[PDB]
A paper describes a structure:
We finally obtained electron microscopy maps corresponding to the nsP1–m7GMP covalent complex by incubation of the nsP1 protein with the m7GTP and SAH substrates and 27-mer RNA, suggesting that the presence of RNA is able to bypass the metastable state and stimulate the guanylylation reaction. We also obtained a similar structure when substituting the 27-mer by a 15-mer RNA. Here, the position of the guanosine base moves as the ribose and alpha phosphate rotate by 56°, bringing the Pα close enough to H37 for establishing a covalent bond. As a consequence of the phosphate repositioning, residue R41 is now closer to the alpha phosphate and a new H-bond is formed between the ribose and S44 sidechain. In parallel, Y248 is now too far from the alpha phosphate for hydrogen bonding, and sidechains of residues R92 and R275 of the neighboring protomer are no longer visible in the maps. Intriguingly, the SAH substrate remains bound in the SAM binding pocket now extensively contacting by VdW interactions the m7GMP moiety as a consequence of its rotation (from 3 to 14 contacts). There is no density for the pyrophosphate product, suggesting that it leaves with the magnesium ions. The H-bonds of the base with E250, and the ribose with Y285, are maintained despite the rotation of the base. E250, Y285, and R41 appear to be the pivotal residues on which the GMP moiety turns for approaching the catalytic histidine, R41 being next to the Pα transfer reaction site. Transfer of the m7GMP to nsP1 is only observed following incubation with RNA, whether in the form of a capped RNA (in this study and in Zhang et al.) or with uncapped RNA in the presence of m7GTP and SAH (in this study).
NsP1 is the membrane anchor for the complex, forming dodecameric pores that associate monotopically with the membrane in the necks of the spherules to gate their entrance. Enzymatically, nsP1 also has a role in addition of cap0 structures to the 5′ end of the positive-sense viral RNAs. NsP1 possesses both N′7 methyltransferase and guanylyltransferase activity and reverses the order of these reactions. Each nsP1 protomer is built around a methyltransferase fold common to SAM-dependent methyltransferases with additional insertions (membrane binding and oligomerisation (MBO) loops 1 and 2) and extensions (ring aperture membrane binding oligomerisation (RAMBO) domain) that contribute to pore formation, oligomerization, and membrane binding.
Residue numbers in the entry:
A (entry chain E), B (entry chain F), C (entry chain G): 3 to 364, 376 to 414, 422 to 450, 460 to 469
The structure:
Amino acid sequence: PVYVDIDADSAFLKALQRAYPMFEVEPRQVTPNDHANARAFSHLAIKLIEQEIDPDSTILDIGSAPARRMMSDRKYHCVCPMRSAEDPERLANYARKLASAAGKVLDRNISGKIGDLQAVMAVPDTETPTFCLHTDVSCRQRADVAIYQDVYAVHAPTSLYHQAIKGVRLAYWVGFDTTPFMYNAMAGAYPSYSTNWADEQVLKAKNIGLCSTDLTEGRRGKLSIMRGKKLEPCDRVLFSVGSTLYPESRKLLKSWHLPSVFHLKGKLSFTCRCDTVVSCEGYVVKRITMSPGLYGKTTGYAVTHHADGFLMCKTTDTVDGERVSFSVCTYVPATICDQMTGILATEVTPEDAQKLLVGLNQTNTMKNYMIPVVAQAFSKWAKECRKDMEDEKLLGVRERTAFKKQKTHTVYKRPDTQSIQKVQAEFDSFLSIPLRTRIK
Amino acid sequence: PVYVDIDADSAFLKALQRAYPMFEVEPRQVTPNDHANARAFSHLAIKLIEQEIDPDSTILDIGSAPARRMMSDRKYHCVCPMRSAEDPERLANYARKLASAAGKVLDRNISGKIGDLQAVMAVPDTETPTFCLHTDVSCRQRADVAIYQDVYAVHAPTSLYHQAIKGVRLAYWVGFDTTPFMYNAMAGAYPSYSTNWADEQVLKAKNIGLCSTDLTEGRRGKLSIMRGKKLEPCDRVLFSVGSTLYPESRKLLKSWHLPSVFHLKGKLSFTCRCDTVVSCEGYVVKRITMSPGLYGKTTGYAVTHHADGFLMCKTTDTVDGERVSFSVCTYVPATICDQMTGILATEVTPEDAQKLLVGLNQTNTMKNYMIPVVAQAFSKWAKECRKDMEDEKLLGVRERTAFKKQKTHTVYKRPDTQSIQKVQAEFDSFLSIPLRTRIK
Amino acid sequence: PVYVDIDADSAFLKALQRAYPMFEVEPRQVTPNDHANARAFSHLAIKLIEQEIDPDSTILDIGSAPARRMMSDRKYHCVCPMRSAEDPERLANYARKLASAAGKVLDRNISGKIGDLQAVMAVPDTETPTFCLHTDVSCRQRADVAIYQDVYAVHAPTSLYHQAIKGVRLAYWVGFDTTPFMYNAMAGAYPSYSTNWADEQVLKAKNIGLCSTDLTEGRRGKLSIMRGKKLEPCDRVLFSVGSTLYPESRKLLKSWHLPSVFHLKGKLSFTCRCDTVVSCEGYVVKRITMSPGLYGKTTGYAVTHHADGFLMCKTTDTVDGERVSFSVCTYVPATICDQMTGILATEVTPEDAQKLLVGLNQTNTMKNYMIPVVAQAFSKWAKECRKDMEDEKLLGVRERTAFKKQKTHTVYKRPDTQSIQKVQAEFDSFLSIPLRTRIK
Ligand SMILES: Nc1ncnc2c1ncn2[C@@H]1O[C@H](CSCC[C@H](N)C(=O)O)[C@@H](O)[C@H]1O
Ligand SMILES: Nc1ncnc2c1ncn2[C@@H]1O[C@H](CSCC[C@H](N)C(=O)O)[C@@H](O)[C@H]1O
Ligand SMILES: Nc1ncnc2c1ncn2[C@@H]1O[C@H](CSCC[C@H](N)C(=O)O)[C@@H](O)[C@H]1O
Ligand SMILES: [Zn+2]
Ligand SMILES: [Zn+2]
Ligand SMILES: [Zn+2]
């Protein structure tokens, strides 16, 4: 019986029961976290990780939070280099949790982490069997399973290779769904988990989940010195999970949309297969299985199965004040898309579409905070499907002179469709002094 | 009592009970697999195979996943050449499951596969009685029954001949229905099992089960250097089942719609009969019975019986941006097609057809993700029948000048019809070092 | 209590109870056969045969499937020449069934067929008392009763004469009803048993139970080199029962519509009477009683009694693309015809007729897959009856100038009418080496 922090009356519990049917979910609250769904899914994924793997295995935990995964009965190796401002707080939490259960729990080898902590505090470059300060590039101890607890700032191919050299059989990756990023979207929804992401340039917008603007009077004279004339996504993107803000890199995050099969040829060439074992409203658990040698041929395509609908809409917003049009992605629950099918056949206006949507939402299924844009996406999809209907062409014959590109303003992946996108598969090229006293 | 992965509340269970009436199906979930129906049907077909065949027989398992079919009480011989990227994972799973039940299950001859695995690891060219690295062309062990567990990249005539030489009495083949591919369609449906296939050229579409497009602005200038001017299917096709992507060859898969009776004349000439013993919403189980000698005369025709309706619709879509009209195939449940019969007699618009279809879907019978296409197919079939009504011709009199070819935009095979197409019947012409250590 | 394969909830069971009232039918499924009704009727007919005939008799079985009729307590003689591609697999099934019950069932004289099988395997030209490799023309052992288990490629007069010379008192024939073939139709229905037939030329149609076409664009230039300008039936016809495709010859199949009484004059002249003892939705059991000598005078006419209505409609279809009009035959249940009698009095359009048909079909009485055609037949029959009404002629006075033939486009035999058709009655003129090892 697994225990979950989410409130008992929350509907997301049911979704969790669908995401983890092999585990019995029991809700109870200890903290009123603004973001409880994400931690609940992470805990369930960790429990499934414990269940699936072989107990007689060494589990690498890259980007680890040592305090969380120390009460586990398995033998973990935490690899937490000091590359973020969050790391010192986690080291403090680990220190308190170690010197709060050292002599009161026996069957957890707590003295092992105690001695390893003393050793690493003494020598910063010592490879302890349960705690390592090195990076994934230069970690040392051989293991067989790797766990990525929501690590988003790392290059997937290089890290996978540098850990496959060490001998991992199979690595799991729990986190957010990468497809909205490989679609080149500006802002995101992840409505159930209350996590919204936005690009740096579109931060000062008005009508997205992640924005903040200021009221102005009738000045058409702000006269910016710098003129770009190209609103394209950039590398830096900011996530807001509950009340905590985290910066990610677009390239590093987008690199996690691994193909179904791929190869890593270097000094030692391995082959790998990646599949989604658990998916729930945006949170995914990928299973990249290591394999020595160079077997088979790779296609170069990545597949995503959308259990619930995906909606990439074209919305105008006042970014920094100026009206600009950009693409925003949204996740729509399966039932809402299911019931909004007959209506999505006519020439429907955004007003009528949004009225029907709120009437459909009754207890809420989807967050009402982001159904001015779902209605817009549905209206534009109806527009496109219609204009496609009475523009029926001829078999096997295009119209090339140079050929006409006609308008696509929204992408509506139905709650049972799958998306293939091309992704590269043939990967070829790959402490502080006061803190030492603070260790005690 | 057979045990099935699919959820208890899923309607597809009933279909399974219709597909396997001799077997009692009991539902329970161990994993939340995105694709559960396909594995369910595969397991049920394997249990049917165990029931039907003679226990005192040697069963060739070509393209085998040895881990799954090793717990069986029969004496299987797995043939798993390293021709796919998944094969290393299959060998790893076999190794773990062998060294996880070696000394705790007795009546399964586990030590046999243990010793045979050591033998093949030692000598890669040794034909062990339960495991081999060879290809179906060059396998050695004599047997009497062959099993094809969803093998899709192989030529049916050559493989059947090369195994019939070895002495198989009868070979079963469980897989997808090959009927849509001899119909020369671009995209596929298989709605119940959530498996959608698409051609190479139509991957970047908008309104099929398997597509992914990007929003673009008003640029009628993409100016492609290469101009084809012929939208015809090619050999490469991509399947997406659940979240896994599998590449298939159009010719190799199309070769599996074998005629009712056919002959294989070579050094030794055999005769064979192929029949569909199990069929459910697309999944089929063919029964090709070997027979030495040359008796009878072949018709050269292959029959598919459609328990549920088949729809070949002509849909426009913006592939890579450019709008073209291509053909998509769809499976419609028998109940929906049955209730939509009298309505399919009028001059019905796609709007009214889609509204009435979504009304008929109430709990869902068919997946609502693909009823803009079914409605269009029904409307066009009504159009064709209506035009066919008042164009009555004379007995035995054609109109040849060179004679008029008037248009069919959809093929609607009713849920009790049979479709025959001409297929060729007179078939005339026919490990790495680190993995070796990884075997332990 | 007869034991039947067809599903318990199916309506056809009721019809079966009407076809065999002397037998108690108990349903259950052992296989999910696509075609279960046909095998059900065949088994019921065989059991009726067992009850009717004298136990102290020798029963010839032409075109035998020895495996099926071996468990019977009576003494059969199977005559199964290698004249079809199905024969080898039937022999293999016979061999397995013989060497699967040789020493565990006693009161069936199994060792008899064992020894006779060894004898024929040794000498291919040996007339064993329970198995024979000769044809019906050149079979040897004298008997008194003959059975035709759905044998379809044989000339009825020649076979009947060559068996009556051997001394058969009476021969039964279980099969499909031959009236639609003597009516010169292109496509057939047999809706209850899900078996559809069609001529070679109309294979590539669109709107029959047996067709397969391909979508095309507006090319009115296919320019066939060969021009026939005549759409008439040919000898070759394709049957599709469930998922099984069988070829028949039109002349041989039409020869089975034997008259009520006929004579065979040769070296020995016999007299025979043919009658239908059991009829159900298309399946018939004829009972041809032999008699030595030349007694009585023959009328030369054959009568078929239609328990359920018969409909020959004139439908236009795109055969290979070209629109041509041909005749299709259909069986309509008695209840539907009875209820649609008042409506069949007015000028009714095909639209209204089909709407009332689907409304009458509610659970389904007749298969909805084929009620575009029944509606057209009913509408055109109503048109013919109407035009027949206000065109009253004078008593016994024709109008001959050469006399006017006016148009019949459908033949509607009511569910209590009988059809008389002229058929000729005065009939005047009439293994491999590896298989031998496979016998073991
Ligand atoms: N290249 C790299 N190799 C190993 N760890 C890295 C890394 N880059 C960043 N990290 C670490 O990964 C952590 C991500 S924060 C995530 C912490 C924890 N997995 C959780 O989900 O709660 C950071 O603390 C950072 O120190
Ligand atoms: N020509 C051939 N002869 C024998 N096996 C082949 C083959 N071509 C491909 N294969 C094997 O067939 C496998 C198909 S993947 C199918 C695995 C398993 N039957 C399942 O359904 O789960 C591949 O792993 C490949 O190694
Ligand atoms: N002229 C002939 N004389 C005797 N048998 C013949 C024949 N022509 C064909 N046959 C046999 O008749 C068989 C018809 S298939 C019918 C099999 C069985 N009676 C059943 O209904 O299931 C063929 O196998 C063929 O071998
Ligand atoms: Zn380390
Ligand atoms: Zn082998
Ligand atoms: Zn004989």
